[PDB]
Ligand binder design. Structure first.
Ligand code: ANP
Ligand code: ANP
Ligand code: MG
Ligand code: MG
Ligand code: ZN
Ligand code: ZN
Lengths: 540, 531
């Protein structure tokens, strides 16, 4: 019994410490978007709610229709490091048990979260304002739960519930039970979550870091020196995931999420055999083989004992002791059989090709927006990273975008999910990408016809590399014929391609598009199987 | 109200790993522990290996300092994540986030055990992830036993607890008996100091430790390019802009240095920072509001005291008397509170009139022309190195070889979580541009073109055509280079920095004015340039 011993504890100032991991502010917002994706949301709405009485003048709200949280899931939010996602073979992005807390506290002083699942609804309130006003150095978190149908309190301690809710009514943006219930009503389905960050951080000039006024369909950094994804959250959100499904809306307006590899001229894929991937997968199998073997030894020991003890023995004493070893044998056999299945699954996975897929294509719409985009378990970590020939002063590989998805066995992310924890191996990957890039440039052979004429044809008349291509009617169409338009159905979440349509070059597409708007007979119903847009194979 | 029934946020075992992922640069994890020794006023830190083939990686990494140490309550606050007494106004401590020892140690190894002594106590703090894994503990449980430094009796309010704590140490730590633990405490020889031992070190895929102490037995190298990114001896030498604390690796002194003293024709440019000014102005306006409120409170309480005295005038009762002193003393306390705040307001007002300037220093690295660029310190601590700025961002020889140094106060920039970057990238980028413009000016000012840039480098013995190769080692070029760089050296005894016209001490100096440890320390006279 260790109950008397000292525990490590969190103090109030740690919330700030933790938040300093995010220099890139959009990386803090990404943590909340990641959590919605991980909860299987089909949509997330990121929107502002004007509140002149709160610091920065609005609250930033993240509303998803994912799985939500029951009361124990909600309580675990404040167990720093706790993540039910951290399982071997995770394709969830979350693994460190920190993102919501590091991200929210970078963005604002306070947050309040509402979540609904099955028959309960829970509020989690993290108020640094309360802590400062009352001189609290611990981290104290109100966590009231109500019945989702009756709205009655669900609590073991009515005095605690009254203190919890009064703290919410005193310090949060919602000053009555009725105002709180209005927030729970914004989660219209059976389940979902609403995170509201408020008292937003200010710049020196007293204005918020986030500008939602300049473009009321966007969230921008309040300050072109910058790539679009570093100043426009609409741009960043579109490419945050390599395989988007979840729809994203900003201030009610759909984000045109995209697969970068489908937005490029003449995409090509190269398989890179990864010695780390294979080495590490082998070591994982060996660990699981060991674990399974030891569990089998222990089960066989207990099974032997049950056999031998039974023959040796009927008093009630001997009956109870025989059953105790018989049940122990049964328990250990079931555990040994579970470890065996884990090991066998890992053995099967080991035989899959241990390769990374590099995809390259030319960004003819914005040739200055080039370099490598490096994803980790499908989540964007690094963008616009120049490699190989791009590191020289040349036109060689100018305009080429590269994409790769790196599994957790090959690389894990830093604390802020904007870098890689193993710099040596990351640099090795960049070197390999650079070599394959050079091969790509040979394989499309622009030198054959020239580069001065290639770019001229898509409307790049200026000698200013970073100037946009011509806007005229012939050049827009010429670029449009090379990159098929793809679009996601708002109903079924399938991705579809649209045949070129000269009447469609003039416009873009509304907040809604559905499969039955498609003119291709082969993909005009939600029922038509999703066609995988496939990338020709190159060799290095 | 009373909040005792309300939920608290808590730390779980896995968070120790999460926190450690901040340190991609492994030497930055080691630097956290060096910082703590510096902050504790250590005059010496020994970073050394103790061989232990039974522990993962084959050795334990030890950090032994002669700093102030920790009393038992100081030691207990180590595991209060975020707690930092160092977080004070005009704090010149590196520590501010209440995290570094925990993030750094858990990047380097699985487990650590710390021994510390201060006055008549000595405390062990044991963070064993091996224990947590073996017994399936999901909280973070930390033995913290204290003994009397002189008698070696336990100092504990709960002997049952103390027995459990020490039994955990003897079971899981590198030291299996009380005698072995006492041996570690005895490695702190003075009245105070701290020994941090990190063990079960992380391994690479090939089963070798990340830290290579074999290739060079006087160094700690990365087992895998700027010297400071592979040699800890190199990195430690430039970790602080104003080194005093001596650093030893495996018992061998590190030649710490002030980068501005190692360069040809160093020059200083003062840069007026609007950010610095505005933030200082706001820190004052806050202090003046705080002193204002306190004054009005004191003035009301003094008024009440006076009025109650005239009203009670003529009352003999014990009651009226005791009550009159409750009010009088309350007035006295508020007055002293108001006066203290008024003093801090005044001190911030005085500091506001100091110049709000950053000092950029540039000089030419004639010994190693390819090791150039800017070194950016934050309250004396190195954050970024070899950062190219201004004309260095071109493919030219202009400003090639120039090293720049600046110390940036917390008011202007604060560090990221891992102290290897800056929290405000916009402001950092602005600083780099300003440094670039001043670098161009420095280059004009030393007039390397008056003599010819090619001939300048020839004279110091750069025979080779490729920028990367070192200059010639012939004797005439060695002396040509050395003659341009004064020799500065630190006394092993008194810690002062000296100039001259291994072990070294003040009395070895031929300068009769610096030839004794009690002679006053001379300041670097870096000449001033203008933008
Ligand atoms: N929108 C959401 N819907 C459902 N569950 C959520 C949501 N946001 C947070 N959670 C839960 O809160 C837990 C902790 O969140 P978080 O602090 O992001 O750490 P994590 O998501 O587990 N891993 P990481 O984010 O990598 O540190 C998650 O594991 C989820 O169980
Ligand atoms: N070698 C040491 N000597 C004396 N005190 C120490 C030592 N190492 C750690 N401490 C104490 O432990 C506390 C926590 O250290 P640490 O975890 O490094 O946080 P910090 O140094 O306060 N600030 P930061 O390092 O910026 O997170 C310090 O504030 C000191 O009080
Ligand atoms: Mg997460
Ligand atoms: Mg520290
Ligand atoms: Zn559809
Ligand atoms: Zn001396």
């Amino acid at each position: 019994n260790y109950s008397s011993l000292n525990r490590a504890q969190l103090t109030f100032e740690y919330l700030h410490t933790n938040s300093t991991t995010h220099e890139f502010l959009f990386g803090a917002l990404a943590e909340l978007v990641d959590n919605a994706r991980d909860a299987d949301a089909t949509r997330i709405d990121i929107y502002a709610e004007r509140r002149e009485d709160l610091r920065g003048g609005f609250m930033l709200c993240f509303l998803d229709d994912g799985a939500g949280m029951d009361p124990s899931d909600a309580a675990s939010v404040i167990q720093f490091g706790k993540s039910a996602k951290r399982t071997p073979e995770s394709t969830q992005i979350g693994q460190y048990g920190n993102g919501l807390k590091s991200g929210s506290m970078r963005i604002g002083k306070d947050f309040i979260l509402f979540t609904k699942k099955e028959d309960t609804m829970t509020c989690l309130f993290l108020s640094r304002t309360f802590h400062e006003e009352e001189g609290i150095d611990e981290v104290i978190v109100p966590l009231p739960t109500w019945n989702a149908r009756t709205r009655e309190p669900v609590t073991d301690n009515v005095e605690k519930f009254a203190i919890e809710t009064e703290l919410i009514y005193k310090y949060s943006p919602f000053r009555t039970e009725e105002e709180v219930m209005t927030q729970f009503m914004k989660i219209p389905g059976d389940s979902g979550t609403l995170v509201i960050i408020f008292n937003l951080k200010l710049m020196d000039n007293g204005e918020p870091e986030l500008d939602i006024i300049s473009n009321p369909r966007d969230i921008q950094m309040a300050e072109e020196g910058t790539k679009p994804e570093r100043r426009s959250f609409r741009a960043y959100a579109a490419v945050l995931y390599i395989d988007p499904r979840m729809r994203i809306f900003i201030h009610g307006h759909k984000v045109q999420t995209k697969r970068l590899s489908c937005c490029l001229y003449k995409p090509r894929m190269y398989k890179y055999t990864s010695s780390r991937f294979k080495t590490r997968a082998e070591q994982e199998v060996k660990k699981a083989e060991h674990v399974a073997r030891i569990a089998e030894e222990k089960a066989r020991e207990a099974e032997s004992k049950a056999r031998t003890l039974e023959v040796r023995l009927l008093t009630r004493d001997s009956r109870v002791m025989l059953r105790q070893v018989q049940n122990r044998a049964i328990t250990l056999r079931r555990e040994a059989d579970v470890k065996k299945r884990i090991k066998e699954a890992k053995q099967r996975a080991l035989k899959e090709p241990k390769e990374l897929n590099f995809v390259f294509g030319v960004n003819i719409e914005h040739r200055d927006l080039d370099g490598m985009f490096i994803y980790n378990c499908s989540r964007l970590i690094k963008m616009y990273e120049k490699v190989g020939p791009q590191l020289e002063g040349g036109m060689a590989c100018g305009g080429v975008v590269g994409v790769v998805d790196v599994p957790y066995l090959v690389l894990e992310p830093r604390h802020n999910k904007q870098d890689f924890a193993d710099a040596k191996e990351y640099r090795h990957l960049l070197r390999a990408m650079g070599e394959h890039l050079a091969q790509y440039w040979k394989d499309i052979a622009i030198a054959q016809r020239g580069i001065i004429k290639f770019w001229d044809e898509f409307g790049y008349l200026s000698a200013n590399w970073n100037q946009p291509p011509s806007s005229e009617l012939r050049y827009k169409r010429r670029r449009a014929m090379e990159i098929p338009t793809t679009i996601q159905c708002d109903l079924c979440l399938k991705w579809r391609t649209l045949p070129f349509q000269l009447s469609s070059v003039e416009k873009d597409y509304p907040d809604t598009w559905v499969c039955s708007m498609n003119p291709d007979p082969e993909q005009d119903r939600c029922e038509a199987s999703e066609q995988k847009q496939k990338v020709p194979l190159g060799t290095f």
